A paper describes a structure:
Full-length [name] consists of an N-terminal PD and a C-terminal collectrin-like domain (CLD) that ends with a single transmembrane helix and a ~40-residue intracellular segment. [name] also functions as the chaperone for membrane trafficking of the amino acid transporter [name], also known as [name] (25), which mediates uptake of neutral amino acids into intestinal cells in a sodium-dependent manner. The [name]-[name] complex exists as a dimer of heterodimers.
During classification, another subset with 143,857 particles was processed to an overall resolution of 4.5 Å. We therefore define the two classes as the open and closed conformations. The PD dimer interface appears much weaker, with only one pair of interactions between Gln139 and Gln175′.
Numbering used by the authors:
A (entry chain B): 60 to 263
B (entry chain B): 332 to 398
C (entry chain B), D (entry chain D): 603 to 738
The structure:
Amino acid sequence: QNMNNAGDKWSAFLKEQSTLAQMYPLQEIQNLTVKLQLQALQQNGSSVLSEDKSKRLNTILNTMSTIYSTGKVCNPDNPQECLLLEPGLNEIMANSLDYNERLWAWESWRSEVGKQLRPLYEEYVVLKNEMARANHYEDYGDYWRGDYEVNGVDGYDYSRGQLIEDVEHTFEEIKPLYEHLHAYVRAKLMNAYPSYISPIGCLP
Amino acid sequence: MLTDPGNVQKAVCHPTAWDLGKGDFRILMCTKVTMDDFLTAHHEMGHIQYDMAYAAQPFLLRNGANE
Amino acid sequence: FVGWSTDWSPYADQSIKVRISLKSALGDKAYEWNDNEMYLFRSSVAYAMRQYFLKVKNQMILFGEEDVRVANLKPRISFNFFVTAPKNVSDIIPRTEVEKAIRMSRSRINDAFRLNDNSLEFLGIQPTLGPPNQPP
Amino acid sequence: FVGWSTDWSPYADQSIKVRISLKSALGDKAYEWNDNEMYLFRSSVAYAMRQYFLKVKNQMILFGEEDVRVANLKPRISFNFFVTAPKNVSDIIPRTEVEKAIRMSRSRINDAFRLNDNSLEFLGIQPTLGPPNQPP
């Protein structure tokens, strides 16, 4: 807190000085040495929010992390032979190279975690959204991209709704590199695993 | 703090680096005597050399660009 | 070989296309098929498993209409469907027993919608009946 | 006034007695009604609400056969029944709309058991059809 609440003695002092810095635009300043300064100005934490129910959400957040870290599947051939995700389940994908047991290990692992964390998810979306709306943004996934909201050198900017459009200008030409690779592994998956794979269609 | 060879002694734990401003760049490491600190050593020394640019430069002038 | 077929699955083989032609048995002046008749069907599909698995397999397993999975709904009363386990949804019903399961109660479902088995098309299941004995 | 009538409820008014006479339409040589034909019926009862509430009430509410509540099962396939909400079971369906709901698909269910509406008795619902026009 000596960095958050003693940041808040400066964050409350920021709301005297940041507003006295908040009369300057983002594009008619080119100094740079002071342009990004007001872009790092909403930083010091979310002191514009009255955080009382974002400090309710951390009670949910520790429950989300505990079940994933304790993600485990007890095997049914003998019920108290159990394997966690990290030393028991990725090893099955590593050591075992069978179709059907890895097919079981794929399905039995996914029948554990996301169902228990689905009621930890719907309220997690919406409460982060008014957290984002009190952070004066449309969604917290936009804030995720808010570090990429650098509008500084008139051509050097990077809108939030354009940074992925150029990414879909990439992989559709890498998609034929997958297409040979798809047919490459479909030439492999017929004699590596017992012939379930359509050599025309998609992958399991 | 560097001390955690195998002990349960009360200290927080990660190999982490800092730019404090005002000419101060700290490390914090949780040394279970292992190679992951030297994995981060030049990894931070590539990144704290960006931080040596904002040695005395403000909180409003933070890390480099993106993550 | 370029691309892929973007809709294949290794469980698509167990799905059955059913094909309803209302202009063939009831013809015109008939009722307009909508999402109720979708919902009527899956109930009456679930029928056929309960009648099969205790008169043939001879143990009870429960079935809701939601176990009848519906895919590619066509206003032309046509869609490929398959049924699963009720809530052991990791496992589905093998189609090889569903083929005999329909043929047992095929006569039950056409009059459940005033149809004639040429409006109950299954593409793999066809009626195998009808020897006549008119002369003494 | 001594005692009480030990079976009255304030929701018994919404229950409908249905009365099946197999010796009237199929007569003899017919199939013996049992708990399957109980279970066939409630599925085909649930039919009539889905066909009503979207062709008349025009919004979707789902119905299982278990929503069709069965009371006083008698051999003569006679029993008073009513239907509820699916799992808002605090509330039930008002009978006043069920009366028009049966009269819409009354013709659907008699041939669903080879019956003649004199083996589909409802005691409050009767067929109101049949004008003839034989001469040109």
